[PDB]
Design a protein around this ligand. Sequence first.
Ligand SMILES: Nc1ncnc2c1ncn2[C@@H]1O[C@H](CSCC[C@H](N)C(=O)O)[C@@H](O)[C@H]1O
Length: 208
Amino acid sequence: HNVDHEEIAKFEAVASRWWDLEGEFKPLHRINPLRLGYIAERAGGLFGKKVLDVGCGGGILAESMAREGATVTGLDMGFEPLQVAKLHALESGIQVDYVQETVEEHAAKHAGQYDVVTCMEMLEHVPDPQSVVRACAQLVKPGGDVFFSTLNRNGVKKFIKPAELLGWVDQTSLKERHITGLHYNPITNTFKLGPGVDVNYMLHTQNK
Ligand SMILES: Nc1ncnc2c1ncn2[C@@H]1O[C@H](CSCC[C@H](N)C(=O)O)[C@@H](O)[C@H]1O
């Protein structure tokens, strides 16, 4: 029910291009090592942890987390993205569980089961983002980590301001721990996480 069918339809339409490093999803492929590194550092490693990737799409982050030895469940409402994610995981020889349902349904059935919940580039596509934040808080174990991010900007989607997201987080059992932005660094000629969240961000929260 907390789903925008038009938004889902857009991702279903481009699903076949998901793993093209030079296609539409290039920025996510480029961004992935950086977000993975941040998640692994902030959560204290992923080996052996139960992890839920909310709005996983084609599985760019999910598969990368499973590669580091996590037990990963990827959740999405799109049919074709999950078909692509499953096939790509098989091709890679990586075990990932992909499910088609809403985060609210998953939360009601799997409360407090996850060590880590990641919710990347997803909130701006939902009709009621606060409900998603509440759900992720319910899905995580006590002391577990929940990450939210918008590192990819477009012309399209809406931008949810970090200050607004913090308000939603504050109504739940999650506590903000760290926030960072993504920036071009001319000296190294690379993109790096660092201060400044005016335009993009990644937020680390921990369940209390
Ligand atoms: N209401 C909803 N419930 C579950 N998934 C949703 C959703 N609305 C959008 N999505 C999914 O969110 C994805 C956004 S693209 C983000 C993919 C992945 N999180 C990554 O960063 O690599 C799309 O695959 C879309 O189908």
